[PDB]
Amino acid sequence: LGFLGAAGSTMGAASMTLTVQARNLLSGDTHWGIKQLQARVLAVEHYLRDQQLLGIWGCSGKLICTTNVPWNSTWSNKTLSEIWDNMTWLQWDKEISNYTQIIYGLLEESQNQQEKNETDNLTCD
Amino acid sequence: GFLGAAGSTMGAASMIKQLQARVLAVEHYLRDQQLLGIWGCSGKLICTTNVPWNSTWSNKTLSEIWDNMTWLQWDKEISNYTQIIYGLLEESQNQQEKNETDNLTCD
Amino acid sequence: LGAAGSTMGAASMTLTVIKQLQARVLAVEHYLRDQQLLGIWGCSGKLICTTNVPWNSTWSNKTLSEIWDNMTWLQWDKEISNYTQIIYGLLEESQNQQEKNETDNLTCD
Amino acid sequence: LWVTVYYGVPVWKDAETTLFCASHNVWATHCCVPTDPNPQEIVLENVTENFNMWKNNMVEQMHEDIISLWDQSLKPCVKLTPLCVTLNCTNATASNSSIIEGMKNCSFNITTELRDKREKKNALFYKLDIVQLDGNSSQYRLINCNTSAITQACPKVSFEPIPIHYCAPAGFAILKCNNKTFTGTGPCNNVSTVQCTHGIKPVVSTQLLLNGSLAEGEIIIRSENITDNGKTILVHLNESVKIECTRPNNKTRTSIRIGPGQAFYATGQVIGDIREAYCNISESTWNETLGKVVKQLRKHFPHKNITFQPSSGGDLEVTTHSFNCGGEFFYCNTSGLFNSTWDSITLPCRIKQIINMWQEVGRAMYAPPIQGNITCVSNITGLILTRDNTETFRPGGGDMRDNWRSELYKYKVVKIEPLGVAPTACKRRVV
Amino acid sequence: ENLWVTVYYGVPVWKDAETTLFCASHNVWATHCCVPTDPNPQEIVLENVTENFNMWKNNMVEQMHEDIISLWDQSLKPCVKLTPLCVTLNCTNATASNSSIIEGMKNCSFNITTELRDKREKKNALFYKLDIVQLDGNSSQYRLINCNTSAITQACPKVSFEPIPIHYCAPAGFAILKCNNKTFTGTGPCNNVSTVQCTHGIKPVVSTQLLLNGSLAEGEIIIRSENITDNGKTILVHLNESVKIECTRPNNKTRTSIRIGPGQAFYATGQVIGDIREAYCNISESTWNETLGKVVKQLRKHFPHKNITFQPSSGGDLEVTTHSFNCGGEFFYCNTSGLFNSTWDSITLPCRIKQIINMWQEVGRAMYAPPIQGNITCVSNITGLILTRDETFRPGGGDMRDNWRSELYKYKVVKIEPLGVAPTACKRRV
Amino acid sequence: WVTVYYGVPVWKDAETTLFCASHNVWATHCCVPTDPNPQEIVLENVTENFNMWKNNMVEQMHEDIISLWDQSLKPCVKLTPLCVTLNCTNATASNSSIIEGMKNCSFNITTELRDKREKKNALFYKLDIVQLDGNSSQYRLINCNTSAITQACPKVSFEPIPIHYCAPAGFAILKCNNKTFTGTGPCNNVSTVQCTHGIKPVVSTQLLLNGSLAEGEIIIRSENITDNGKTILVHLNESVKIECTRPNNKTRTSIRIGPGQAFYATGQVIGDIREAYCNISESTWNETLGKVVKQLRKHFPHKNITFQPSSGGDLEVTTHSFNCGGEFFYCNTSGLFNSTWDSITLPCRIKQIINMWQEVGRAMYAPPIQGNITCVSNITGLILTRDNTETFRPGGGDMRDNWRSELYKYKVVKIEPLGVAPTACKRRVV
Amino acid sequence: XXXXXXXXXXXXXXXXXXXXXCXXXXXXXXXXXXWXXXXXXXXXXXXXXXXXXXXXXXXXXXXXXXXXXXXXXXXXXXXXXXXXXXXXXXXXXCXXXXXXXXXXXXXXXXXXXXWXXXXXXX
Amino acid sequence: XXXXXXXXXXXXXXXXXXXXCXXXXXXXXXXXXXXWXXXXXXXXXXXXXXXXXXXXXXXXXXXXXXXXXXXXXXXXXXXXXXXXXXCXXXXXXXXXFXXXXX
Ligand SMILES: *[C@@H]1O[C@H](CO)[C@@H](O[C@@H]2O[C@H](CO)[C@@H](O[C@@H]3O[C@H](CO)[C@@H](O)[C@H](O)[C@H]3NC(C)=O)[C@H](O)[C@H]2NC(C)=O)[C@H](O)[C@H]1NC(C)=O
Ligand SMILES: *[C@@H]1O[C@H](CO)[C@@H](O[C@@H]2O[C@H](CO)[C@@H](O[C@@H]3O[C@H](CO)[C@@H](O)[C@H](O)[C@@H]3O)[C@H](O)[C@H]2NC(C)=O)[C@H](O)[C@H]1NC(C)=O
Ligand SMILES: *[C@@H]1O[C@H](CO)[C@@H](O[C@@H]2O[C@H](CO)[C@@H](O)[C@H](O)[C@H]2NC(C)=O)[C@H](O)[C@H]1NC(C)=O
Numbered sequence A: 001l002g003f004l005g006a007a008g009s010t011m012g013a014a015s016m017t018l019t020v021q022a023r024n025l026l027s028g029d030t031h032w033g034i035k036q037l038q039a040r041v042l043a044v045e046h047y048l049r050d051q052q053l054l055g056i057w058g059c060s061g062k063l064i065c066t067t068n069v070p071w072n073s074t075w076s077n078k079t080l081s082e083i084w085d086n087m088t089w090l091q092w093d094k095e096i097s098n099y100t101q102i103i104y105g106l107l108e109e110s111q112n113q114q115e116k117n118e119t120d121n122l123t124c125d
Numbered sequence B: 001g002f003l004g005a006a007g008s009t010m011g012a013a014s015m016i017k018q019l020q021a022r023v024l025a026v027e028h029y030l031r032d033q034q035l036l037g038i039w040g041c042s043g044k045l046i047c048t049t050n051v052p053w054n055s056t057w058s059n060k061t062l063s064e065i066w067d068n069m070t071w072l073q074w075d076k077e078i079s080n081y082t083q084i085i086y087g088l089l090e091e092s093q094n095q096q097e098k099n100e101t102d103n104l105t106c107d
Numbered sequence C: 001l002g003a004a005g006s007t008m009g010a011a012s013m014t015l016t017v018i019k020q021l022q023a024r025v026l027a028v029e030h031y032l033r034d035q036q037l038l039g040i041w042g043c044s045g046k047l048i049c050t051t052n053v054p055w056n057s058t059w060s061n062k063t064l065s066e067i068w069d070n071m072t073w074l075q076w077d078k079e080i081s082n083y084t085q086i087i088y089g090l091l092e093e094s095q096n097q098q099e100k101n102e103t104d105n106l107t108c109d
Numbered sequence D: 001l002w003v004t005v006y007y008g009v010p011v012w013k014d015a016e017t018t019l020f021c022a023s024h025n026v027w028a029t030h031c032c033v034p035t036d037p038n039p040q041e042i043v044l045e046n047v048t049e050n051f052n053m054w055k056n057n058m059v060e061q062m063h064e065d066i067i068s069l070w071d072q073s074l075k076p077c078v079k080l081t082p083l084c085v086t087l088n089c090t091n092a093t094a095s096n097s098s099i100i101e102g103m104k105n106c107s108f109n110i111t112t113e114l115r116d117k118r119e120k121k122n123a124l125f126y127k128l129d130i131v132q133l134d135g136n137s138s139q140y141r142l143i144n145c146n147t148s149a150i151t152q153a154c155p156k157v158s159f160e161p162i163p164i165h166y167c168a169p170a171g172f173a174i175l176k177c178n179n180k181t182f183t184g185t186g187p188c189n190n191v192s193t194v195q196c197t198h199g200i201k202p203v204v205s206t207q208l209l210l211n212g213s214l215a216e217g218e219i220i221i222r223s224e225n226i227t228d229n230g231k232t233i234l235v236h237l238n239e240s241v242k243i244e245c246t247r248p249n250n251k252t253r254t255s256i257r258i259g260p261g262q263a264f265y266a267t268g269q270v271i272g273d274i275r276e277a278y279c280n281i282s283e284s285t286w287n288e289t290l291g292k293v294v295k296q297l298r299k300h301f302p303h304k305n306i307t308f309q310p311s312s313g314g315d316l317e318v319t320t321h322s323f324n325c326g327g328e329f330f331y332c333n334t335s336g337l338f339n340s341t342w343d344s345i346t347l348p349c350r351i352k353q354i355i356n357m358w359q360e361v362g363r364a365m366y367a368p369p370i371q372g373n374i375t376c377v378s379n380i381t382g383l384i385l386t387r388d389n390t391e392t393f394r395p396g397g398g399d400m401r402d403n404w405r406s407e408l409y410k411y412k413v414v415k416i417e418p419l420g421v422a423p424t425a426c427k428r429r430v431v
Numbered sequence E: 001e002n003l004w005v006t007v008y009y010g011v012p013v014w015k016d017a018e019t020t021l022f023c024a025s026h027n028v029w030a031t032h033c034c035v036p037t038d039p040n041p042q043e044i045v046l047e048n049v050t051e052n053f054n055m056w057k058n059n060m061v062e063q064m065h066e067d068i069i070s071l072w073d074q075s076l077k078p079c080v081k082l083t084p085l086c087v088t089l090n091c092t093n094a095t096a097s098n099s100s101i102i103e104g105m106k107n108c109s110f111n112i113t114t115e116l117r118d119k120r121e122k123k124n125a126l127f128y129k130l131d132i133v134q135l136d137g138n139s140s141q142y143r144l145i146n147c148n149t150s151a152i153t154q155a156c157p158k159v160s161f162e163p164i165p166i167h168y169c170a171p172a173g174f175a176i177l178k179c180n181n182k183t184f185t186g187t188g189p190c191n192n193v194s195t196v197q198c199t200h201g202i203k204p205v206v207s208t209q210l211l212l213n214g215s216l217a218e219g220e221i222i223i224r225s226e227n228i229t230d231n232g233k234t235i236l237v238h239l240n241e242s243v244k245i246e247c248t249r250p251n252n253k254t255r256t257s258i259r260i261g262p263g264q265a266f267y268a269t270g271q272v273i274g275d276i277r278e279a280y281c282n283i284s285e286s287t288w289n290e291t292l293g294k295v296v297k298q299l300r301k302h303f304p305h306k307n308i309t310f311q312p313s314s315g316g317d318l319e320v321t322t323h324s325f326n327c328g329g330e331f332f333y334c335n336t337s338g339l340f341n342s343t344w345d346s347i348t349l350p351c352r353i354k355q356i357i358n359m360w361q362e363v364g365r366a367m368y369a370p371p372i373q374g375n376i377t378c379v380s381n382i383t384g385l386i387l388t389r390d391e392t393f394r395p396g397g398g399d400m401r402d403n404w405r406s407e408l409y410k411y412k413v414v415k416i417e418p419l420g421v422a423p424t425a426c427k428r429r430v
Numbered sequence F: 001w002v003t004v005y006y007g008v009p010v011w012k013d014a015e016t017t018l019f020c021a022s023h024n025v026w027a028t029h030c031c032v033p034t035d036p037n038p039q040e041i042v043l044e045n046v047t048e049n050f051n052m053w054k055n056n057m058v059e060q061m062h063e064d065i066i067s068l069w070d071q072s073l074k075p076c077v078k079l080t081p082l083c084v085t086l087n088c089t090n091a092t093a094s095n096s097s098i099i100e101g102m103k104n105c106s107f108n109i110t111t112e113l114r115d116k117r118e119k120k121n122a123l124f125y126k127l128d129i130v131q132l133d134g135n136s137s138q139y140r141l142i143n144c145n146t147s148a149i150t151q152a153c154p155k156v157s158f159e160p161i162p163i164h165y166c167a168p169a170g171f172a173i174l175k176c177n178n179k180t181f182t183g184t185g186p187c188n189n190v191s192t193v194q195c196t197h198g199i200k201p202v203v204s205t206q207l208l209l210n211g212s213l214a215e216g217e218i219i220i221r222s223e224n225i226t227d228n229g230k231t232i233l234v235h236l237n238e239s240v241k242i243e244c245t246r247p248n249n250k251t252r253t254s255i256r257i258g259p260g261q262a263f264y265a266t267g268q269v270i271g272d273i274r275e276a277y278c279n280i281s282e283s284t285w286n287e288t289l290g291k292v293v294k295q296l297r298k299h300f301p302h303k304n305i306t307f308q309p310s311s312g313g314d315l316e317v318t319t320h321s322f323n324c325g326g327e328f329f330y331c332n333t334s335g336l337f338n339s340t341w342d343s344i345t346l347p348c349r350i351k352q353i354i355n356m357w358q359e360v361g362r363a364m365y366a367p368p369i370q371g372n373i374t375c376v377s378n379i380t381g382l383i384l385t386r387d388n389t390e391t392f393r394p395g396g397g398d399m400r401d402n403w404r405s406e407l408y409k410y411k412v413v414k415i416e417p418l419g420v421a422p423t424a425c426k427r428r429v430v
Numbered sequence G: 001x002x003x004x005x006x007x008x009x010x011x012x013x014x015x016x017x018x019x020x021x022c023x024x025x026x027x028x029x030x031x032x033x034x035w036x037x038x039x040x041x042x043x044x045x046x047x048x049x050x051x052x053x054x055x056x057x058x059x060x061x062x063x064x065x066x067x068x069x070x071x072x073x074x075x076x077x078x079x080x081x082x083x084x085x086x087x088x089x090x091x092x093x094c095x096x097x098x099x100x101x102x103x104x105x106x107x108x109x110x111x112x113x114x115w116x117x118x119x120x121x122x
Numbered sequence H: 001x002x003x004x005x006x007x008x009x010x011x012x013x014x015x016x017x018x019x020x021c022x023x024x025x026x027x028x029x030x031x032x033x034x035x036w037x038x039x040x041x042x043x044x045x046x047x048x049x050x051x052x053x054x055x056x057x058x059x060x061x062x063x064x065x066x067x068x069x070x071x072x073x074x075x076x077x078x079x080x081x082x083x084x085x086x087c088x089x090x091x092x093x094x095x096x097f098x099x100x101x102x
């Protein structure tokens, strides 16, 4: 159940463990210690890069976040019952692997447009 | 002062070596931020949850005892429930998000 | 950096941005320092954040809004280079008061 | 439908990183990190994964650490550079007759602790450790004074293998294959996640795989492209064969001071059985073991009866069975084990003090002698075989990665990828 | 109960912890502890806070030890090796300027290879007897001490090891607690505790029987021990008044630079000018007699009226029987007999000088101190004493960490744990 | 009202470490592929201050190159055992005639094992050998006076492949795009890049070889024109083709030093007797200097200008020192700088013990290169110093001057994303 | 004190050369040696820095009249003359100021102790 | 460097005197690296003073001014015994000697 125990669960059942998987991403003499130091520095960078993406997409502070970007049937033409009840996350990750970079670019642009509209155009004069 | 009022009760109390050290400072920082965020305290020093106090962790009439105990003593008193409470807080936040995006009655 | 040097009002929507260990660690430290400051201020998660601190007219000669769009950021930063630590301190004090006021003015269920 | 962003999604990718080594022993000193006192394992229900023992990089990574520790452990020790002098090397006598060919009584002029003083010293050396400089002129040198320095291992330092567990860093996981019929490559339909691998002792040997784990099922023959003759075959036994090895005599050693706190340890005399070292394999066990291997081998080669031949030739390091027994290196014959078509077997064995364990051009090590007698007992858990009408098999060998692939075949290292997206019915609200 | 968990961040609690502390401000110490100190140190009174301190188990003492060894090695590593000098020495009797003999020195001739690795020359130098070992009986042939155990290296004259105050500072997330009650003595609870980020500066002064240039005890003389009734568990006596000690080597030495190799030179001792008085230390008599009596009065608070007496160390070599005083860079090994001599205007301690030392019991390592030209005068403050028990006491000695523990005893490192929970009568609103 | 902005297009001058980026030393460390399609942003209406002599990148690259040089040579053969007395006579070549500059030297070396003292010999250049006494055949190598000589191993190339230096995250490199920029003033047309162009770390003394030619006319750059204590870097807009050679076939031997070590040395030379010479086009050289002077006179419009065929200091700086493949040439420039306002065929000298970097305590020995060698190179600039009329002389000799001339258009700055400005509104929800 | 015994030399008619040196009463080489010219002419001049102490150099008495030379085996040192001339028809003497370290080069802060009986060959 | 002193015709007894040296070179970068010696008729020179201090094992009747241009006047001239004496610029390789007047 813990860590990756839910990995083979369906898309729907899975995610009841998002907190567990997320907390387990952080960690809690001579030359060999340098290799270990390098690994720690990289682990931090990877954590932060994911946080930077959540920031730019407007999902900071949330494990589950929705956006204003519509789903393109091109990416997948399956319905929700198949996606959430029969399919798993490992399968899904493979199914739309070639669209990840598109969706991420769209999420960044959508957030920028939202902010553009949110910005107060001198209401107070 | 930083640890000032450490001996006060809650009512008031609540108001190459260099690279290794820098890395640890960062890891400790990030763990506190992740852990607060994952429970719903992102951006806050104090927040509440929907997780009830079980009374088994401590059976004290804390609504009054709060003002006659310090944080140091309290931290010792319930140290055995640290993971239990934290686990419940994580579950609570995750369930709240699942209710927010429930397709039947979404946000 | 990206595009740079334009008159400040034109900057809207432009806000889109062993030695090896030392470089990586410092890059992380600098990143976090800015996030921590945005954190103490009511600015976390935002490119643009609005304060509770009035601009102090003592700092520069504010010819109403013209000062906001008659030069780029480079000259502006120089004009007020000696007030940055004052402005930042005031923003922290104001947000600290806001935190105390929200803490005491509890809503709850 | 609308895009939903998720963080903490339990998915992963094949990945490479540095694993932690967890455990006056060198392995214990280096792998100072404690093991998990209560290792956990999480079975992943409805998960399949692709494993490949010939390409998982866990073997390559430990190789680098095995080499690094070996060399680093030997660096702060006595150099034998001043011993590269002409030696006399006459026939040494242990007792009575001077008939022991293997040992020579080498006398020489060597600089002592004071730079302006020199002394005549002597020690006994093995034939395999020396080379004749001029045919029939009785002038000898140590074999590695031809190309490099020889470092004497520190007598206080133990290289005895201890079990080592490799552990993932945060952000990574090790997946384990639980299929007894896996064979080394392909999908496993029963996969569990662990933080640390089982312990593996860093035992170094040739031809026979010693002190490993046993197969869960029947004998497993694991090879890449088994139909090729360009590939090595690892045979993993389901029962261990007991092997006992000894050097049946009491060695007494001297100490020659060669610098400001540095001394060379060497054989002074040997008292006891003048014969070479011997290893004993029960005969009935060996024949049963080989017959069982053949029964499974016949599934890949269901043809004419298989012939087992001795190794083909080459340097002693690749033609014989090497043993990391105590502080002495055994070079044992396998003839009689691999001479067949499909109560004890005694095999003669030579001893060397100067070795090059990792076949490094720039390295040589001198092993201080063991005082007294040695007995070494071990578990034969597998074989390294090569193949070249019928099939011919030989006790050939690889690059000593075989020694680790044989245990690290069921593990894979992956990196966790917490982000992903999926469609929903819910659009972000304006609020 | 209608209580829900409330999460608080910024909670004033902590745990015992061990971390890496960093130090702050041609001197080796100044070069390494390059980090500026806090010009305006802060301190928190910690109202109503008690804490448990244990100097005997304080990891900072050990960490300071690791730093001194490491710094020493960084400084000594990039220097001249004297292993080319491990040759037979053809020695005669003691010599001196004009019509005199310096007891303790010998005139030795040796065979040194020139820079061309072919031509050889002989050179003469004077050496201390304590640095020379005889090769056999009834023989004039000698070798340098330790050429039979370890490499001997030469310290570079370019670097100063003079102690400067070193301040230790906790890293972010950590703080240092101090016991400021006075009369704390040994381990146990302290009822007047404060929080600081950095320690006071401590000079890394290394000595044996007498602890020099530390702070003084406030209040009365403090006797610190771990189970004082034991014979072992070395007793640290911290004085509330200092005793002035003046040490000197009243003679003019010269130095000869001998080339020993392709970019290397050895510094030899040449002729010595002036009277021959060896070396000595001056201690006021009444000051010592009164100081020791005060210590005894405090010992009488731990022991019943008893036959209290002081004697010189019972044995061992100079490193444990003498006062291993560094003075001006030559090493002094001064005789404390006559100082620790009692039963319950000035006195002088005769003193010996050495050039080859093994530092902090490194044993397998040795260092040669180049001679100091001209004469040396050093004045130090005796701030504490080290004693062991047989009520007969002897100076004994420590593990060379008592010169740190005597200053670090008031400090403890703790990890700050700002996150925590408690129940409150408030449910989250959604 | 104070509005806070993040991601603001502001930068400040800063110093950081740039990436090395990208059998070969340079390739071993600068092993990271460069941007296949570098981007550049023009900063409209931006002026920035560039200063060649205050540019820390020149110094940083210098320190890194030295490190690369030493790191490469460290794991190689030491020639320490060869610092022995040599027995030297006159060497001959091709014919029975003596070839000037070469001596036939013998010595006793251990080679295999111990005590062989095998007599070996080699031909050596006079420039690498110093006489031990008057009227004597006995010699030593010049570096026996200071240090060990490390032999460079043939296994590794030091060829100056171009390297693009790249800024770390949080930093950017600004570039000056003014074709006539003088090196110290504001640049009124600038752009931003992440990496510099590829700069070949070419080593030379008096002449600047294989650089990038000026976009505009010949640009004369100095920190200060008036100050005769400053170096003048002349950046040419047209190159001069230079062809240098060693017109003989060298054969080398290998002398075992010990296990894992061998000395490479000249066995014999067959071919021309002239040791070396160099072909500089006559017309190009004369016109090139005239053009430099026409431009020099706008900075120095005084009477007449003369270039004197003179220099001071020792051979490392009085000549044109450059590498030719793995060979070390020292060419006489007196045949070039001789004029007041076919080919030149300059004589050249060859030397094997190279005190590269002009540091004390280090030397490298250049193994002999078998067969004959030719090199072609482009003079892209000159280094001059000076002092009624004015006299200029070849200057330089400082390796950093060869890099300052390429990095002159680049500056490193730190990006500073935070800032504030006044606005009309207060936060709406308080 | 070296108390060296001057070896002396025969006089020459502005011809040949000499390096008589003085034999030390104790030690050889070591780190205390010197050589000087002598005359009834304001004590002439230092001739050579025949200092032992692993070093030697010429002094100011003459730019190129003699070179510092020594033999530890003989317990003696002198500058060795060449191309003798009438101008050199004067006395010579030995001394042994002790060596010392003084930064660059050297300084004879130590007095020129142990002057020899000296000799002359004018 | 150069040395000379106006010590000509120093015919005296009881009252000590010496002329100061030219000290063209101060010869005093550290510890006054300059020295005095004197010689009786038909005698080797002997140190009189060094670094303006009475020479060791020389005589009680010795003194010198604390100056580069020091005069090594005897502490007393009770013994008379005038003899040639001179300073040398010891700091210099060219340790120039004074006139060596009585
Ligand atoms: C201020 O600096 C700018 C550089 O930062 C100059 O802009 C450059 O002008 C060049 C033409 O003079 C452009 O060359 C083009 O490069 C592309 C590369 O792919 C080629 O195909 C084109 O054929 C080539 N054009 C021509 C006419 O050869 C540079 O690309 C351009 N650089 C950038 C970054 O835009 C400004 O000209 C300069 N201004 C002044 C006043 O000097
Ligand atoms: C200035 O730039 C020129 C041009 O790149 C440099 O010339 C090149 O120098 C190298 C090294 O000497 C030559 O490489 C050799 O080529 C032969 C060809 O047969 C090969 O057998 C060798 O193994 C080696 O690879 C290269 O050919 C030569 N290029 C040309 C056009 O001649 C010159 O060295 C640079 N000058 C300086 C000071 O850096
Ligand atoms: C011993 O050596 C020291 C220097 O190492 C001499 O010190 C000098 O003393 C005089 C006294 O008047 C001072 O004026 C100088 O300035 C001192 N020198 C330095 C460098 O400070 C000392 O005199 C010598 N003593 C003997 C007996 O020779």
Ligand SMILES: *[C@@H]1O[C@H](CO)[C@@H](O)[C@H](O)[C@H]1NC(C)=O
Pocket: D091, D092, D093, D094, D105, D122, D124, D268, D269, D270
């Ligand atoms: C080797 O030779 C020495 C010569 O003294 C002899 O004493 C020793 O016993 C010999 N050793 C053996 C094993 O023959």
Ligand SMILES: *[C@@H]1O[C@H](CO)[C@@H](O)[C@H](O)[C@H]1NC(C)=O
Pocket: D305, D341, D342
């Ligand atoms: C040869 O093969 C047959 C089966 O085809 C088997 O019965 C027989 O025992 C085999 N011979 C040997 C030597 O194993």
Ligand SMILES: *[C@@H]1O[C@H](CO)[C@@H](O)[C@H](O)[C@H]1NC(C)=O
Pocket: F303, F304, F340, F341
């Ligand atoms: C000196 O300068 C004048 C400037 O008009 C020029 O005509 C003359 O040719 C110059 N002298 C030389 C030697 O070129």
Ligand SMILES: *[C@@H]1O[C@H](CO)[C@@H](O)[C@H](O)[C@H]1NC(C)=O
Pocket: F277, F278, F279, F342, F343, F344, F345
């Ligand atoms: C190049 O140098 C050679 C040297 O012998 C010379 O003969 C030849 O003429 C020179 N080239 C030109 C163009 O003069």
Ligand SMILES: *[C@@H]1O[C@H](CO)[C@@H](O)[C@H](O)[C@H]1NC(C)=O
Pocket: E090, E091, E092, E095, E107, E108, E109, E124, G026, G027, G028
């Ligand atoms: C020092 O020892 C050498 C040994 O040969 C001797 O010749 C010399 O005279 C001794 N020095 C003194 C001052 O006695």
